Design an enzyme around this catalytic site. Structure first.
Site, PDB file in Angstrom:
ATOM      1  N   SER A  51      -9.772 -19.281  -2.623  1.00  0.00           N
ATOM      2  CA  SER A  51      -8.965 -18.120  -2.965  1.00  0.00           C
ATOM      3  C   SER A  51      -8.618 -17.423  -1.658  1.00  0.00           C
ATOM      4  O   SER A  51      -9.499 -16.872  -0.987  1.00  0.00           O
ATOM      5  CB  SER A  51      -9.696 -17.180  -3.912  1.00  0.00           C
ATOM      6  OG  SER A  51      -8.875 -16.033  -4.104  1.00  0.00           O
TER       7      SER A  51
ATOM      8  N   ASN B 233       1.982 -21.308  11.210  1.00  0.00           N
ATOM      9  CA  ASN B 233       2.744 -22.550  11.129  1.00  0.00           C
ATOM     10  C   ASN B 233       4.051 -22.378  10.355  1.00  0.00           C
ATOM     11  O   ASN B 233       4.651 -23.373   9.933  1.00  0.00           O
ATOM     12  CB  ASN B 233       1.881 -23.677  10.548  1.00  0.00           C
ATOM     13  CG  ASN B 233       1.448 -23.436   9.119  1.00  0.00           C
ATOM     14  OD1 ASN B 233       2.003 -22.593   8.412  1.00  0.00           O
ATOM     15  ND2 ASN B 233       0.459 -24.207   8.673  1.00  0.00           N
TER      16      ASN B 233
ATOM     17  N   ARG C 204     -27.259   7.179 -12.764  1.00  0.00           N
ATOM     18  CA  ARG C 204     -26.630   7.064 -11.452  1.00  0.00           C
ATOM     19  C   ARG C 204     -27.483   7.725 -10.369  1.00  0.00           C
ATOM     20  O   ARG C 204     -27.619   7.184  -9.265  1.00  0.00           O
ATOM     21  CB  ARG C 204     -25.215   7.651 -11.472  1.00  0.00           C
ATOM     22  CG  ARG C 204     -25.127   9.144 -11.795  1.00  0.00           C
ATOM     23  CD  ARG C 204     -23.724   9.643 -11.533  1.00  0.00           C
ATOM     24  NE  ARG C 204     -23.590  11.061 -11.850  1.00  0.00           N
ATOM     25  CZ  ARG C 204     -22.767  11.888 -11.221  1.00  0.00           C
ATOM     26  NH1 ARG C 204     -22.065  11.498 -10.166  1.00  0.00           N
ATOM     27  NH2 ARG C 204     -22.634  13.135 -11.668  1.00  0.00           N
TER      28      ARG C 204
ATOM     29  N   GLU D 268     -12.598  -1.914  -2.135  1.00  0.00           N
ATOM     30  CA  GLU D 268     -13.646  -2.592  -2.890  1.00  0.00           C
ATOM     31  C   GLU D 268     -13.652  -4.100  -2.663  1.00  0.00           C
ATOM     32  O   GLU D 268     -14.721  -4.715  -2.668  1.00  0.00           O
ATOM     33  CB  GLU D 268     -13.488  -2.299  -4.382  1.00  0.00           C
ATOM     34  CG  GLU D 268     -13.675  -0.819  -4.776  1.00  0.00           C
ATOM     35  CD  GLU D 268     -12.461   0.039  -4.481  1.00  0.00           C
ATOM     36  OE1 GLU D 268     -11.361  -0.514  -4.261  1.00  0.00           O
ATOM     37  OE2 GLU D 268     -12.619   1.280  -4.478  1.00  0.00           O
TER      38      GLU D 268
ATOM     39  N   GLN E 248     -11.020   6.079 -14.604  1.00  0.00           N
ATOM     40  CA  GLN E 248     -12.351   6.082 -14.011  1.00  0.00           C
ATOM     41  C   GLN E 248     -13.413   5.489 -14.917  1.00  0.00           C
ATOM     42  O   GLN E 248     -14.572   5.379 -14.497  1.00  0.00           O
ATOM     43  CB  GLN E 248     -12.745   7.525 -13.649  1.00  0.00           C
ATOM     44  CG  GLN E 248     -11.589   8.366 -13.067  1.00  0.00           C
ATOM     45  CD  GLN E 248     -11.178   7.941 -11.678  1.00  0.00           C
ATOM     46  OE1 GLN E 248     -10.001   7.696 -11.415  1.00  0.00           O
ATOM     47  NE2 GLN E 248     -12.141   7.845 -10.781  1.00  0.00           N
TER      48      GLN E 248
HETATM   49  C1  LIG Z   1     -12.927   7.730  -3.379  1.00  0.00           C
HETATM   50  C2  LIG Z   1     -12.023   8.515  -4.258  1.00  0.00           C
HETATM   51  C3  LIG Z   1     -11.226   9.479  -3.816  1.00  0.00           C
HETATM   52  C4  LIG Z   1     -10.895   9.909  -2.535  1.00  0.00           C
HETATM   53  C5  LIG Z   1      -9.424   9.866  -2.197  1.00  0.00           C
HETATM   54  O1  LIG Z   1      -9.153  10.384  -0.855  1.00  0.00           O
HETATM   55  P1  LIG Z   1      -7.692  10.488  -0.413  1.00  0.00           P
HETATM   56  O2  LIG Z   1      -7.746  10.860   0.997  1.00  0.00           O
HETATM   57  O3  LIG Z   1      -6.904   9.299  -0.726  1.00  0.00           O
HETATM   58  O4  LIG Z   1      -6.985  11.661  -1.245  1.00  0.00           O
HETATM   59  P2  LIG Z   1      -7.087  13.331  -1.106  1.00  0.00           P
HETATM   60  O5  LIG Z   1      -7.788  13.590   0.207  1.00  0.00           O
HETATM   61  O6  LIG Z   1      -5.651  13.703  -1.103  1.00  0.00           O
HETATM   62  O7  LIG Z   1      -7.958  13.780  -2.291  1.00  0.00           O
HETATM   63  S1  LIG Z   1     -10.405  10.157  -5.306  1.00  0.00           S
HETATM   64  C6  LIG Z   1     -11.585   9.167  -6.421  1.00  0.00           C
HETATM   65  C7  LIG Z   1     -11.566   9.440  -7.755  1.00  0.00           C
HETATM   66  O8  LIG Z   1     -12.372   8.831  -8.521  1.00  0.00           O
HETATM   67  C8  LIG Z   1     -10.658  10.590  -8.515  1.00  0.00           C
HETATM   68  O9  LIG Z   1      -9.471   9.643  -8.963  1.00  0.00           O
HETATM   69  N1  LIG Z   1     -12.162   8.182  -5.636  1.00  0.00           N
HETATM   70  C9  LIG Z   1     -12.874   6.957  -6.113  1.00  0.00           C
HETATM   71  C10 LIG Z   1     -11.935   5.817  -6.167  1.00  0.00           C
HETATM   72  C11 LIG Z   1     -12.453   4.707  -5.529  1.00  0.00           C
HETATM   73  N2  LIG Z   1     -11.617   3.507  -5.648  1.00  0.00           N
HETATM   74  C12 LIG Z   1     -10.436   3.532  -6.365  1.00  0.00           C
HETATM   75  C13 LIG Z   1      -9.708   2.202  -6.403  1.00  0.00           C
HETATM   76  N3  LIG Z   1      -9.981   4.569  -6.932  1.00  0.00           N
HETATM   77  C14 LIG Z   1     -10.730   5.690  -6.813  1.00  0.00           C
HETATM   78  N4  LIG Z   1     -10.113   6.676  -7.561  1.00  0.00           N
HETATM   79  C1  LIG Z   2      -0.084 -20.167  -2.204  1.00  0.00           C
HETATM   80  C2  LIG Z   2      -1.223 -21.073  -1.823  1.00  0.00           C
HETATM   81  C3  LIG Z   2      -1.325 -21.665  -0.551  1.00  0.00           C
HETATM   82  C4  LIG Z   2      -0.341 -21.428   0.612  1.00  0.00           C
HETATM   83  C5  LIG Z   2      -1.091 -21.151   1.860  1.00  0.00           C
HETATM   84  O1  LIG Z   2      -0.162 -20.930   2.862  1.00  0.00           O
HETATM   85  P1  LIG Z   2      -0.770 -20.542   4.280  1.00  0.00           P
HETATM   86  O2  LIG Z   2       0.388 -20.321   5.114  1.00  0.00           O
HETATM   87  O3  LIG Z   2      -1.758 -19.395   4.218  1.00  0.00           O
HETATM   88  O4  LIG Z   2      -1.550 -21.773   4.809  1.00  0.00           O
HETATM   89  P2  LIG Z   2      -1.068 -23.245   5.469  1.00  0.00           P
HETATM   90  O5  LIG Z   2       0.378 -23.127   5.712  1.00  0.00           O
HETATM   91  O6  LIG Z   2      -1.895 -23.330   6.774  1.00  0.00           O
HETATM   92  O7  LIG Z   2      -1.401 -24.289   4.399  1.00  0.00           O
HETATM   93  S1  LIG Z   2      -2.670 -22.700  -0.494  1.00  0.00           S
HETATM   94  C6  LIG Z   2      -2.901 -22.445  -2.215  1.00  0.00           C
HETATM   95  C7  LIG Z   2      -3.746 -23.272  -2.904  1.00  0.00           C
HETATM   96  O8  LIG Z   2      -4.010 -23.223  -4.272  1.00  0.00           O
HETATM   97  C8  LIG Z   2      -4.621 -24.266  -2.291  1.00  0.00           C
HETATM   98  O9  LIG Z   2      -6.111 -23.532  -2.115  1.00  0.00           O
HETATM   99  N1  LIG Z   2      -2.123 -21.451  -2.776  1.00  0.00           N
HETATM  100  C9  LIG Z   2      -2.300 -20.664  -3.984  1.00  0.00           C
HETATM  101  C10 LIG Z   2      -3.166 -19.439  -3.822  1.00  0.00           C
HETATM  102  C11 LIG Z   2      -2.639 -18.233  -4.297  1.00  0.00           C
HETATM  103  N2  LIG Z   2      -3.455 -17.139  -4.242  1.00  0.00           N
HETATM  104  C12 LIG Z   2      -4.701 -17.230  -3.718  1.00  0.00           C
HETATM  105  C13 LIG Z   2      -5.500 -15.933  -3.746  1.00  0.00           C
HETATM  106  N3  LIG Z   2      -5.272 -18.292  -3.259  1.00  0.00           N
HETATM  107  C14 LIG Z   2      -4.475 -19.383  -3.347  1.00  0.00           C
HETATM  108  N4  LIG Z   2      -5.175 -20.460  -2.939  1.00  0.00           N
HETATM  109  O1  LIG Z   3     -20.077  14.890 -10.890  1.00  0.00           O
HETATM  110  C1  LIG Z   3     -18.926  14.729 -10.510  1.00  0.00           C
HETATM  111  C2  LIG Z   3     -18.319  13.351 -10.327  1.00  0.00           C
HETATM  112  O2  LIG Z   3     -18.343  12.626 -11.561  1.00  0.00           O
HETATM  113  C3  LIG Z   3     -19.093  12.574  -9.277  1.00  0.00           C
HETATM  114  O3  LIG Z   3     -20.109  13.381  -8.671  1.00  0.00           O
HETATM  115 CA   LIG Z   4       1.325 -21.414   6.722  1.00  0.00          CA
END
Ligand SMILES: CC1=C(CCOP(=O)(O)OP(=O)(O)O)S/C(=C(/O)CO)N1Cc1cnc(C)nc1N
Ligand SMILES: CC1=C(CCOP(=O)(O)OP(=O)(O)O)S/C(=C(/O)CO)N1Cc1cnc(C)nc1N
Ligand SMILES: O=C[C@H](O)CO
Ligand SMILES: [Ca+2]
Ligand SMILES: O=C[C@H](O)CO
Ligand SMILES: [Ca+2]
Lengths: 620, 620
Positions: free
Chosen positions: B123, B184, B317, B365, B427
């Site tokens: 992947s 490439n 938690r 994440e 959330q």
């Molecule tokens: C970590 C986090 C926040 C901080 C965002 O900071 P920022 O700088 O982008 O924005 P502001 O400073 O403008 O607040 S808001 C929050 C939540 O759970 C509330 O949605 N989370 C947890 C969070 C973690 N990961 C993802 C994918 N989404 C999230 N919402």
């Molecule tokens: C789209 C894709 C490839 C192209 C890779 O191109 P590259 O330029 O990064 O590498 P090379 O030109 O050096 O081959 S290899 C491939 C496969 O399913 C085979 O694992 N797939 C499907 C693919 C799509 N998405 C993800 C997350 N992984 C994949 N393996």
């Molecule tokens: O308690 C508030 C938020 O759910 C995380 O601390």
């Molecule tokens: Ca390539």
């Protein structure tokens, strides 16, 4: 169309508006006892300038197809979104105080039950991808004059999905798209990595092809000017701001993310902010140019029946591409998206026949799903995205949020199961039924031959929610006649007799292995019923139970998928407790390995011999 | 150690090695009938120089802890990985021809059953994150001299996870890490977006904080020189290459990705390449400096029993953070990772007490999971990563690949279910049990109070595979004595009598709602048995069935999760067909909304009143 260069009175009104937006964000979150006022306050001038100078929209018709789009990617600033729509006169001001109540639709993060929200956000880093879909639609499909604005946080910019969207927008020259970065220095639990190093943000945006403008994000004049200039490429407004701006003692401080002000403090702070507002008179929104076209939303019907003949060999992945290209002649709203796998999923067939409605998304599955969600907003298009089903696990949070967004998108994942053979488990989808079944708005199609695949594409096009179509690599025989009628939730019994001793449920490759097992077992005077679910979700419980009651109560499920969350568990959950019914389960019990398709079906116990042996064991 | 500047003969031996690697990649994929020789051939000089000039490793002990690490992020080039390990003398040359056979372990993509593979790839876009974990471990945990090299494709660089890793490496100053970009020009189904615009690749890498060197990727001399200079930053070697390099008629051509050469063509091409090889003499690998420390492998035990008191209120938690910090005092192997949510998951408690072993991963994440996988390779650390459970859906592909990598990582996801209340569904984890149950190496802990949480943390630390701990926001009562013994796969009956009418199975907040329902029902002379699963996978089938047989065969499962793939379906799949057993299932039936925790538990039918109502209906 010309920039309206604001006078000092207009600028002061925009400052007044920003401070009203601060007050409302504080009032609402203090009333609720939860929320993110400091995340609202850093964006107040941005929001004021967007909604009351730059954007063009119908204030009483937020969903209007001619409107500029705004995407609040940092969705936890929802209270200031609600505040601007009250300021614009759409929302009643009193309703802002009902934030987060079960009696209100002003929920903690924006959701499309709100007329002014197209996509749910709250999972950070997804809004720009949806915005890219909206902008792509506006530029290339609608060919309309509306622009798309997306507000992001700075901690949010750590998500890789954001940079997929950045790269997409420059590849596709989305000069109708503006990203506003709220660089307020702080994330949730620490400063954001780059803090106020504005030059590094600029270098990163420019390297990804965007026109990048650093502004004082609390200067309404700098914001008006930055939004007002002629875009020749996607434009990033990189706004230096302070979190909690305007809240004395809280501005620029840690330990305040997601913390409301206590009542006594809110009253004191609001008085201070109100003392800065020079006039209560509100700015009116300005309506848009109405040049978005009409779109046909009638039921979509294939131009002809499938043209297969029983006995022909075709992989369902190839039938998918053929059916999708055919569906493109049935509706102008069909678009196709693929992640550099079009020659493997056969979406290349649609590309060849309808190139202007194919979107190459490259190796970026998270962004691909978000693009599709954006393209589907306001019912502008009917998207079908495709990749290997295994790689839809890369986009699970986007798919999850798509259901919270009440989005109507279609996803086709190929190369399911061990039956792909030699590539090995990294390419094998063995958890996609579990994943898509857990998406609440989902319909899970698992077509077993070319005819069922074409019928699934047609049904999916007309079905609301997250539609998933699971396609396969092995060439299997056509078993259905071309005029077979298919429906969501209706299974097919493809082999039956009065002397059936088990009902065997298979799908895709394991339906054909079950039919092969049936032929083997007939040589020992053993008849089995064979049932093709067609949709794994919703499951045809009645036909499964009626079948089992005709076969001594015995059900055997066999699937090219792990045990958890797949066909066997769906069937067991549907029939548990029914008197006299038993369910035996053949599935893949561990991470597989490389070999020929038939060798792996044997090794992991889901081929015709494993089915026949399980049947014999049931009879004895 | 000083750079050994190679003479013309060493350079020619490296070219000879590269061409041997080309020949083997062609031979093996032509023999298998599948594979990616053109993807191998663009990387041949890179691989020759890395393995036979730059890197230091024990050729007969690939897992040795002092070795430099190599990560093949573009895993479909596996044949050339196998070829170098034959050239180094670890792998028998004849075994290369058994690529992709079910009788071989030279599978289609690399997997850890191969001694020379740490993480499975296949992947795309995940290798650099794992490499970051290895390099972080080398620099800050092992404090050893080994370096980490990661080879990526250019289409692969469209994955946002790659750029999360790029940013991570510059934040943490991973000057022991080198990324090699095989530019490439071509992806699978079209040219990669940037093709051979080497300057844009350089600008993107530099903007993300890397020292970026453009080289001719087919010049062994430029590669030796670029690899031979250490830096104070992570270093990106941006190699201009041609896909299918050295295959006349195929080099730099489309339509050849994943296409093997037919036999007649392979023979002709191999003869051409062999005519360029000047000597059969092979270069020897050079061994590493042996300064990685010993690591203990013993069981890890909490320093004392839990110190909660029955009746006290604590959210699981918070109990997680307390337990993780406590465990950090017992073993220096424990490390913690979090994605800017440490104040919400309470991993901040571990950061406070053990700051050297906390890794802030920011809002990324996918990378966080890959960092953990990398830190766990060669058993160097025992990682616990945490965020909201809902945001682990962002990393599902990384988790999926972690199981294919046979990785031992621990994941704690907080804020599960509607019981978080006002933030709303973005959330709310409602599909995490489905997701983690579908991961084949997973153990799923769902602790219902603080004691169970501390026990789950300790058990998880000593359990192989993908361990998931689901924690909750409500502050529920301690119900277990501190000395209660807990085991994987063992449930607990927390309420029973001889006149029990139903066995009610709940977990976390719904266990406490079940206990409250039991009190409501006692007013009506209705006793219920209440069962706490502790682990959802594996499920204590025996105790569930023994309980059901004592309660007239009746089971009621209630869970703060969607219907599919969660507790109810696990139970139903376990007991289906058992005589006299019935299962009623209460779960969340659709995307939720904002409200108070208790209001949402009621709205979605999983609170004490919904449970009691279901019991009253069963008894009739
Ligand atoms: C970590 C986090 C926040 C901080 C965002 O900071 P920022 O700088 O982008 O924005 P502001 O400073 O403008 O607040 S808001 C929050 C939540 O759970 C509330 O949605 N989370 C947890 C969070 C973690 N990961 C993802 C994918 N989404 C999230 N919402
Ligand atoms: C789209 C894709 C490839 C192209 C890779 O191109 P590259 O330029 O990064 O590498 P090379 O030109 O050096 O081959 S290899 C491939 C496969 O399913 C085979 O694992 N797939 C499907 C693919 C799509 N998405 C993800 C997350 N992984 C994949 N393996
Ligand atoms: O308690 C508030 C938020 O759910 C995380 O601390
Ligand atoms: Ca390539
Ligand atoms: O040929 C089939 C491969 O699996 C994808 O095209
Ligand atoms: Ca911020």
């Amino acid at each position: 169309e010309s920039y309206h260069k604001p006078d000092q009175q207009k600028l002061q009104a925009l400052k007044d508006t920003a401070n009203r937006l601060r007050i409302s964000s504080i009032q609402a979150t203090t009333a609720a006892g939860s929320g993110h006022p400091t995340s609202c306050c850093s964006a107040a001038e941005i929001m004021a300038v967007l909604f009351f100078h730059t954007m063009r929209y119908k204030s009483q018709d937020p969903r209007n197809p001619h409107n500029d789009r705004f995407v609040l990617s940092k969705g936890h600033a929802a209270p200031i979104l609600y505040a601007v729509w009250a300021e614009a006169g759409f929302l009643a001001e009193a309703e802002l105080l009902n934030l987060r109540k079960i009696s209100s639709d002003l929920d903690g993060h924006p959701v499309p039950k709100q007329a002014f929200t197209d996509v749910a956000t709250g999972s950070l880093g997804q809004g720009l991808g949806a915005a890219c879909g909206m902008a792509y639609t506006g530029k290339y499909f609608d060919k309309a004059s509306y622009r798309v604005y997306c507000l992001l946080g700075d901690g949010e910019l750590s998500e890789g999905s954001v940079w997929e969207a950045m790269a997409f927008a420059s590849i596709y020259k989305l000069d109708n798209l503006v990203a506003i970065l709220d660089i307020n220095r702080l994330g949730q639990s620490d400063p954001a990595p780059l803090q106020h190093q504005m030059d590094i943000y600029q270098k990163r945006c420019e390297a990804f092809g965007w026109h990048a403008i650093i502004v004082d994000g609390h200067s309404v004049e700098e914001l008006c000017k930055a939004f007002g200039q002629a875009k020749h490429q996607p434009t990033a407004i990189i706004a230096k701001t302070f979190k909690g701006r305007g809240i004395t003692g809280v501005e620029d401080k840690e330990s305040w993310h997601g913390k409301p002000l206590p009542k006594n403090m809110a009253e004191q702070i609001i008085q201070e902010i109100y003392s800065q507002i020079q006039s209560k008179k509100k700015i009116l929104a300005t309506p848009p140019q109405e040049d978005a076209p009409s779109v046909d939303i009638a039921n979509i019907r294939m131009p002809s029946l499938p043209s297969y003949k029983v006995g022909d060999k075709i992989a369902t992945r190839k039938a998918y591409g053929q059916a999708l290209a055919k569906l493109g002649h049935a509706s102008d709203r069909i678009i196709a998206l693929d992640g550099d796998t079009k020659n493997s999923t056969f979406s290349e067939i649609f590309k060849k026949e309808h190139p202007d409605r194919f979107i190459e998304c490259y190796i970026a599955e998270q962004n691909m799903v978000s693009i599709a969600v954006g393209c589907a907003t306001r019912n502008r298009t009917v998207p079908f995205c495709s990749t290997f089903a295994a790689f839809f696990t890369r986009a699970f949070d986007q798919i999850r949020m798509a259901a919270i967004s009440e989005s109507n998108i279609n996803l086709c994942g190929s190369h399911c199961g061990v039956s792909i053979g030699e590539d090995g488990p990294s390419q094998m989808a063995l958890e996609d039924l579990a994943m898509f079944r857990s998406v609440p708005t989902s319909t899970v199609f698992y077509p077993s031959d070319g005819v069922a695949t074409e019928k699934a594409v047609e049904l999916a096009a007309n079905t609301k929610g997250i539609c998933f179509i699971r396609t396969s690599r092995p060439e299997n025989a056509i078993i259905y006649n071309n005029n077979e009628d298919f429906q969501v939730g209706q299974a097919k019994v493809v082999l039956k007799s009065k002397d059936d001793q088990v009902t065997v449920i298979g799908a895709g490759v394991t339906l054909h292995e079950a039919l092969a097992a049936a032929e083997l077992l007939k040589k020992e005077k053993i008849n089995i019923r064979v049932l093709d679910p067609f949709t794994i979700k919703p499951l045809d419980r009645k036909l499964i139970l009626d079948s089992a009651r005709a076969t001594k109560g015995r059900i055997l499920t066999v699937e090219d998928h792990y045990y958890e969350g797949g066909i066997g568990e769906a069937v067991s959950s549907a029939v548990v407790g029914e008197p006299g019914i038993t369910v035996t389960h053949l599935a893949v019990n561990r991470v597989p390995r490389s070999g020929k398709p038939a060798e792996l079906l044997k090794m992991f116990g889901i081929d015709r011999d494993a089915i026949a042996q399980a049947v014999r064991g049931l009879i004895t």
